[PDB]
Design a binder for this molecule. Structure first.
Ligand SMILES: Cc1ccc(C(=O)N2CCC[C@H]2C(=O)NCc2cc(Cl)ccc2CN)[nH]1
Ligand SMILES: *[C@@H]1O[C@H](CO)[C@@H](O)[C@H](O)[C@H]1NC(C)=O
Ligand SMILES: [Mg+2]
Lengths: 252, 11, 29
């Protein structure tokens, strides 16, 4: 996270760390959506340009964390993966279209003060909140700068950007399965996600029922926090039919 | 850079 | 847990607000 701040304790209890077993390192972010299901970006698991193709046994999910590198004894919970499900129409070749994956845990995670699921939006919440100017929150343990690494979970609040402004900022083709966020060079404020924050959630607090909803998944950007560039997020609601299909077919 | 984790999860 | 989703034990469950959630609410016009 670039131009963010340290998260408060229990501020993002759905935040999940995707952790590589060997060498021991942070791979990505992810989010807890039930006691058995974790949501992340498909590119965190499969990205052939970088020779990335992780299998279940290669990874651990660490839930309830705050410190990036420390083992947070009696707080964090470490879970093993039962199965990885990548969107069948995930487009790693061009623009990371449908950058979404689900991970089913071997055992259910016990909820606590530091571990709690985020909601998934329904059509009404998405239509009400996914609007230009409305701000969401991005969290992660990723790089602090494009060209170092934080001691604890970082947080940044960022405004959703108008689709024409998103499209005009880049040469990449932007799809309806993406939305973009960040400040315009003229706004004065800064911030973005960066490498290592992918798979993490873009959340919004509904002013109707006071619950936190995961509207986006940290996906891609041209660098980190560049003027005139924006961060791109997977549109969770647009891919909810796939989410529900996977959960309905492979059990909750 | 990462503090070691219990072996029960690494196996 | 769908029923209780998105309600934080250290915040919403205790009617405590975090330091920057007000910035999100203010943006929802
Ligand atoms: C122009 C372009 C092609 C691919 C990427 C990209 O961002 N990738 C390729 C695979 C990993 C992912 C990444 O770095 N995501 C993190 C990220 C996410 C966001 Cl929202 C903003 C910036 C960044 C940092 N580039 N960007
Ligand atoms: C990823 O690995 C699996 C084996 O675990 C293989 O079947 C699959 O074809 C690989 N995908 C790519 C795109 O390399
Ligand atoms: Mg920018």
């Amino acid at each position: 996270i670039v131009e963010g701040s340290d998260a408060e304790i229990g501020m993002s209890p759905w935040q999940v760390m995707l952790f590589r077993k060997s060498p021991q390192e942070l791979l990505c972010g992810a989010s807890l959506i039930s006691d058995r299901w974790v949501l992340t970006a498909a590119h965190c698991l499969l990205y052939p340009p970088w020779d990335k193709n992780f299998t279940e046994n290669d990874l651990l999910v660490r839930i309830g964390k705050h410190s990036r590198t420390r083992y947070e004894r009696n707080i964090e919970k470490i879970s093993m993966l039962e199965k990885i499900y990548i969107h069948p129409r995930y487009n790693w070749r061009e623009n990371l279209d449908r950058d979404i994956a689900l991970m089913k845990l071997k055992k259910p995670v016990a909820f606590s003060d530091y571990i709690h699921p985020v909601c998934l939006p329904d059509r009404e919440t998405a239509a009400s909140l996914l609007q230009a100017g409305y701000k969401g929150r991005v969290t992660g343990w990723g790089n602090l700068k494009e060209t170092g690494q934080p001691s604890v979970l970082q947080v940044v609040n960022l405004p959703i950007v108008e689709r024409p402004v998103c499209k005009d900022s880049t040469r990449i083709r932007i799809t309806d399965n993406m939305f973009c966020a960040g400040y315009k060079p003229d706004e004065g404020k800064r911030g973005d996600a960066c490498e290592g924050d992918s798979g993490g959630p873009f959340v919004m607090k509904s002013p109707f029922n006071n619950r936190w909803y995961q509207m986006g998944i940290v996906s891609w950007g041209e660098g980190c926090d560049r003027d005139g560039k924006y961060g791109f997020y997977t549109h969770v609601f647009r891919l909810k039919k796939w989410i529900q299909k996977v959960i309905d077919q492979f059990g909750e | 850079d990462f503090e070691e984790i219990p072996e029960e999860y690494l196996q | 847990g769908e029923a209780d989703c998105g309600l934080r034990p250290l915040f919403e469950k205790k009617s405590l607000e975090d330091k920057t959630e007000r910035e999100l609410l203010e943006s929802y016009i």
